[PDB]
Paper text:
4-Diphosphocytidyl-2C-methyl-d-erythritol kinase ([name]) catalyses the ATP-dependent conversion of 4-diphosphocytidyl-2C-methyl-d-erythritol (CDPME) to 4-diphosphocytidyl-2C-methyl-d-erythritol 2-phosphate with the release of ADP. This reaction occurs in the non-mevalonate pathway of isoprenoid precursor biosynthesis and because it is essential in important microbial pathogens and absent from mammals it represents a potential target for anti-infective drugs. The enzyme displays the characteristic α/β galacto-homoserine-mevalonate-phosphomevalonate kinase fold, with the catalytic centre positioned in a deep cleft between the ATP- and CDPME-binding domains. Gel filtration and analytical ultracentrifugation indicate that AaIspE is a monomer in solution.
Although data for complex I were measured from AaIspE co-crystallized with the relatively stable ATP analogue AMP-PNP only ADP could be modeled. The lack of electron density for the terminal phosphate groups of CDPME2P and AMP-PNP is either a result of disorder and/or hydrolysis. In complex I, [name] displays a single conformation in molecule A and three in molecule B (not shown). Such conformational freedom, distinct from the ordered substrate, may reflect loss of the methylerythritol component and the numerous stabilizing interactions that it forms deep within the enzyme active site. The cytosine moieties of the four [name] molecules interact with Tyr24, His25, Lys145 and Tyr175 with differences (not shown) confined to the orientation and binding modes of the solvent-exposed ribose and phosphate groups. One [name] conformer in molecule B is similar to that observed in molecule A. In the second conformer in molecule B the α-phosphate occupies a similar position but the β-phosphate group is directed out of the active site to interact with both Tyr24 OH and the carbonyl of Ile127. This latter interaction suggests that protonation of the phosphate has occurred. In the third conformer the α-phosphate interacts with the backbone amide of Gly172, the β-phosphate group with the Ser169 carbonyl, Thr171 amide and OG1.
Numbering used by the authors: -1 to 268
């Protein structure tokens, strides 16, 4: 009852660098987050606390449910909202779809409940569940530090066409970080120079070691990477895979080869 709809956007990493290993066993990163016009559709209704999707994600596993239940635990308030998410952003595509879902729902539910959580409290809540989530409370363009949750909004000189080519294989972030050799690490200073160049519009400066690894672990990601090269474009990888992107439009040759393999092609403009 009283149905409202909210969009839940995807992100790409315009470069990612691993800086070190933290006491938790998690890795410190530098990355440039970019919100893209590619959305999940979320329906928010008054009713029993429920989180359903259209792709069969178990409610207990759902980041949105874990968020709303933690909301209840922290605030003592009973959340009486039914959530249905139409999942267009594929899980494991390195596009932070789950984190986006988490962030947008909790921000809206907070607002609906008269904002019992401050910006600091909302951000720390979503961040405790997912490091990529706080970015989606800002959107647009931001440098991500720590594990990604320490953010600095920036304005980039990047505009024009960006095309995503999404393989079928779902990339595991855990497996990718586990294959990461201590020699793949870089200094924050190196990564900072790279990011500054990318912000200025020098997209050829984008790189991502997790993509190097994803390509070694999941051959289909490598196939997509190689195919984008064959088309005469520099390919880039989002998150820990699986999505390969490039700066140019989708051609009929790409589209046809995608349909034959089941690759999702997403044509964006910034
Ligand atoms: N609402 C959600 N949407 C997508 N994935 C989710 C959600 N809740 C939990 N997950 C988990 O996150 C994994 C995929 O991560 P996702 O955030 O979609 O992209 P990535 O982590 O590759 O950037 C899934 O395998 C799934 O188990
Ligand atoms: N910044 C990060 C993010 C993830 N990881 C690793 O990747 C695993 C899976 O990441 P995830 O965010 O998809 O799942 P969680 O285990 O965080 O719930 C984590 O358990 C970490 O071991 C990391 O080392 N550093
Ligand atoms: Cl890359």
């Amino acid at each position: 009852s009283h149905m409202i709809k909210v969009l839940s956007p995807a992100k790409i990493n315009l470069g990612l660098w691993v800086l070190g290993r933290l006491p938790s066993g998690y890795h410190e990163i530098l990355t440039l987050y970019q919100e893209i016009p590619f959305y999940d559709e979320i329906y928010i209704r008054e009713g029993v606390l429920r989180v359903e999707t259209n792709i069969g994600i178990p409610q207990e596993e759902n980041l949105v449910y874990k968020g709303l239940r933690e909301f209840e635990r922290i605030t003592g308030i009973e959340i009486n909202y039914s959530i249905f998410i139409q999942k267009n952003i594929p899980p494991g595509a390195g596009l932070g779809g789950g984190s986006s879902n988490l962030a947008v729902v909790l921000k809206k539910v907070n607002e609906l409940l008269g904002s019992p959580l401050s910006e600091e409290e909302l951000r720390e809540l979503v961040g405790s569940i997912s490091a990529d989530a706080p970015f989606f409370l800002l959107g647009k363009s931001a440098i991500g530090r720590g594990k990604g949750e320490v953010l600095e909004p920036v304005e980039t000189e990047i505009s024009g066409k960006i095309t995503l080519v999404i393989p079928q294989v779902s990339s595991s972030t855990g497996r990718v970080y586990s294959s990461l050799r201590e020699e793949h690490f870089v200094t924050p200073e190196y990564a900072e120079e790279k990011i500054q160049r990318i912000i200025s519009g020098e997209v050829e400066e984008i790189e991502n070691v997790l993509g190097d690894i994803a390509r070694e672990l999941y051959p289909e990601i490598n196939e997509v990477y190689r195919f984008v090269e064959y088309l005469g474009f520099k390919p880039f990888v989002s998150g820990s895979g699986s999505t390969v992107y490039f700066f140019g439009g989708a051609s009929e040759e790409l589209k046809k080869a995608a349909k034959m393999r089941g690759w999702k092609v997403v044509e964006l403009e910034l």
